[PDB]
Amino acid sequence: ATIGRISTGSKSLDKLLGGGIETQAITEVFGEFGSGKTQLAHTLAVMVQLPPEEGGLNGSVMWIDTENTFRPERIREIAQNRGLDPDEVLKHIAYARAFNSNHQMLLVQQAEDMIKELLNTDRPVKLLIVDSLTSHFRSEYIGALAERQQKLAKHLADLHRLANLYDIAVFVTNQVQANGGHILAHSATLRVYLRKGKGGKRIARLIDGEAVFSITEKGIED
Numbered sequence: 001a002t003i004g005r006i007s008t009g010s011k012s013l014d015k016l017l018g019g020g021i022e023t024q025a026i027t028e029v030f031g032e033f034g035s036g037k038t039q040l041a042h043t044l045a046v047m048v049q050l051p052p053e054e055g056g057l058n059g060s061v062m063w064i065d066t067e068n069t070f071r072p073e074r075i076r077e078i079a080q081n082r083g084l085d086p087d088e089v090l091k092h093i094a095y096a097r098a099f100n101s102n103h104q105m106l107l108v109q110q111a112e113d114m115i116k117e118l119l120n121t122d123r124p125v126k127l128l129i130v131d132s133l134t135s136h137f138r139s140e141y142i143g144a145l146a147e148r149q150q151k152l153a154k155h156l157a158d159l160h161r162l163a164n165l166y167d168i169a170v171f172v173t174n175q176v177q178a179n180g181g182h183i184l185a186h187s188a189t190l191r192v193y194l195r196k197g198k199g200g201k202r203i204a205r206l207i208d209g210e211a212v213f214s215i216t217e218k219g220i221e222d
């Protein structure tokens with residue numbers, strides 16, 4: 001398949017990304033608590049449902065939530081201010097809460113079943129969100145870094161296999177603050193550092209110019 005791109009909702013961020021986040025790729029956004037990573041996830045879950053003329057892929061979404069941070073009412077607001085029907089947008093997001101890191105790993109295998117089911121339809125899965133990818137692994141493997149890295153590595157390999165095999169954009173969030181961080185090392189296809197700036201602006205930079213945007217009723221925008 002050719003590489004598809006999903007607009008983020010921000011012209012600035014899209015330019016930094018070469019058009020949007022890519023299918024057949026893992027995009028990792030990392031930054032401190034409150035930097036806006038989950039707002040970007042919510043916005044992408046709407047944008048991907050637009051036609052390509054508007055920066056989408058007519059795609060379905062699968063969302064793995066590790067922190068109980070998915071908000072359907074926020075999806076509704078973004079959809080209504082992106083000219084989409086909110087009920088339809090929500091009906092094309094498959095949602096699951098991961099109870100721990102082992103369940104999170106099983107959910108990725110379960111996602112493949114729904115991906116296969118939708119593959120030849122008019123609304124194939126085009127976006128898989130894992131928010132937050134690292135939170136359970138971090139809490140469960142305190143004092144056991146070597147074992148944590150083994151399990152994360154297999155989890156990321158599973159996500160890569162899905163991105164490439166099924167032409168999906170995988171979007172993952174990672175909280176990194178004071179003294180913290182191996183990030184995801186070099187595993188993601190693309191690492192995006194997100195931070196708060198003056199006056200509530202958000203600033204994004206590729207790791208390995210900068211885009212600036214705001215969180216609004218449209219999700220994010222310039």
Ligand SMILES: Oc1cc2ccccc2cc1O
Pocket residue numbers: 062063064094095096107108110111114
């Ligand atoms: O109904 C489902 C929703 C999911 C969401 C994310 C990951 C896996 C899922 C599997 C399902 O059957």
